[PDB]
Every structure is written in C-alpha cells, then in structure tokens.
Design a binder for this molecule. Structure first.
Ligand SMILES: CN1CCN(C(=O)c2ccc(F)c(F)c2)CC1
Length: 284
C-alpha cells in the first residue's frame, strides 16, 4: 500500500508529520491529528490547505485528500472551523485551550480586530495561563513578552498586559483560558469568516459567515444580518452567489439576494462554508 507524507501546522506553530494511504479521505488524516492533540471535541475543528490560487480551503473529510490538494503539496493547517458561541459549554478544557490558540492567531493576524484594552486583557490571560502568577524578577520596567498579542506591538501595550497580569494572581490555566474566551467571544468579528464580494450594483462588500448567520458589510454605516433560520436556499452559479430568504409574515414571495465573487472557485467556497455553518449551527 503506497503512503503519502502529510505535514500539518499545529496551532502552537509546530509541525506534525504522519503518513496516510495515498487514496485516504480527509477524515483519516484529521483523526490522526486529533489523536496527536488528545482532542475529543473534534466537531469544531478541521484542516485547511492552500489551492493552486493560494486560497485557504477546508479539507473535506468525506473526500480523497489527493482529489482536493490535486497538484499541490500535502501540507495542511489545523484550525477552528466552527467557533463555539458559548465556549463555557464545551465539555473539555483542552478544547478551550485549542480555541484560545486559534483566537491568538486571529488577533495577531488582524482577522479579529480588538480595542487596545481588550488586546491587553486577552494578552494578560494568555500570560497567566502560560507563565502563571506575575513575577517582578522576570518583568522590569523595560519588559517585552516573547508572546505575540497584537498585529502591532507598542511598549504601552506591553505595560498594560503586565498591569492586568498582576491582577490575576492565583488564577489557574483553565480559569485564565475561560476568561480569555468569555472576553474574545464578545468581539464583533469573533468567528466571522470574511469573503470579498460585489453587490448586484458592483459595489465592493464583504460577506461574513458565522454561527448567527450571514453578514453583509457595505461600509462603516449599515450592516445587514440574515440569521440562518431565515435562509432556505444557498446557491452558486458561475461567479455568483445567491441566498433564498424566507418570506416575512404576510409577504407572498421568498426573496433571492445575489453577489459577484472574484471567480467560480470563490463562489463555490463561500457556498460550501455557508451550507456547513447552516447545518452545524441550526441545532442552537
Ligand atoms: C456532526 N454534527 C453533530 C451534531 N451537531 C452538534 O451537536 C453541535 C455541536 C456544537 C454546536 F455548537 C452546534 F451548533 C451543533 C453538529 C455537528
């Protein structure tokens, strides 16, 4: 039986390497990574790969790996796919731990915008979990953490992390991680997967996919929201993406809203992530 080497970037930035039979489905590799991570609450997570256009794609666990990566390398990242709206209800601390690691990357990358004070507060809970109690011996007036907290670091931010870290004396790692998540879950872009698109006029918008529904970001003024219950059909055709909205009370007709994506692969990718979010979260 011929086997293909897989490299998976883990959320702490280390590499997991394993082999699978070359006709293996995505679930096979995912199960190996999840066993490596001692992770049981696996339904929130997935593997990503980069396609020949360098776009992030979810590895479909039901389909052959080779039919997804095609000409590309068998190189993956382990990621949160469905962000829990209420991380306190997850069964295991280790699940909360991986969710924190993902969110730390979402913050540092700028995918998850965050006020100065919330960057410092989240940073302070990370430091508490990772180093434990504040120690002045390691932290002088000139201290800069090895920990990445933000898309740009300033000394003011480093100082505020330390001031808040001092307040967390006695806090255990699982407790600090739960505080991290209770704060992160409130951020307007928490667990929002953003897609560039054009409205049926030609105006550049962003489409956001998350637990609560589909978001349309036109600009700083006027954000549209379609809760998943209010969506009966999602479809794509060529470069276009459409959603079938349920009629409101006493309306005769459903209403269909349409968007232009960069290319056909982008429209298909947005359709699939919407269907998957809809299916996963219509049990809330
Ligand atoms: C494979 N299915 C199993 C059933 N299912 C859930 O139990 C579920 C878990 C957590 C959630 F937040 C949620 F919205 C739903 C979705 C995935």
């Amino acid at each position: 039986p011929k086997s293909m080497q897989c490299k998976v970037i883990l959320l702490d930035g280390s590499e997991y390497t394993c082999d699978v039979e070359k006709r293996s489905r995505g679930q096979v590799l995912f199960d190996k990574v999840c066993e490596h991570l001692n992770l049981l609450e696996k339904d929130y997570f997935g593997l990503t790969y980069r396609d020949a256009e360098n776009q992030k794609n979810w590895l479909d666990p039901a389909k052959e790996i080779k039919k997804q990566v095609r000409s590309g390398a068998w190189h993956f990242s382990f990621n949160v796919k469905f962000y829990p709206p209420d991380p306190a209800q997850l069964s295991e601390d280790i699940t909360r731990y991986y969710l924190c690691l993902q969110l730390r990357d979402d913050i540092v990358s700028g995918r998850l915008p965050c006020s100065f004070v919330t960057l410092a507060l989240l940073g302070s809970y990370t430091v508490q979990s990772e180093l434990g109690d504040y120690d002045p011996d390691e932290c002088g007036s000139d201290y800069i953490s090895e920990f990445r907290f933000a898309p740009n670091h300033t000394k003011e931010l480093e100082d505020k992390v330390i001031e808040l870290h001092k307040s967390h004396r006695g806090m255990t790692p699982a407790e600090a991680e739960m505080h991290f998540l209770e704060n992160a879950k409130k951020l307007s872009m928490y667990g929002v997967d953003l897609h560039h698109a054009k409205d049926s006029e030609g105006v550049e918008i962003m489409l956001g996919v998350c637990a609560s529904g589909l978001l349309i970001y036109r600009d700083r003024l006027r954000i549209n929201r379609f809760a998943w219950p209010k969506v009966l059909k999602i479809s794509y055709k060529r470069n276009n993406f459409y959603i079938k909205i349920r009629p409101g009370e006493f309306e005769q007709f459903e209403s269909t809203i349409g968007f232009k994506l960069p290319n056909h692969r982008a429209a298909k990718r947005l359709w699939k992530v919407c269907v998957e979010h809809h299916t996963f979260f219509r049990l809330l």
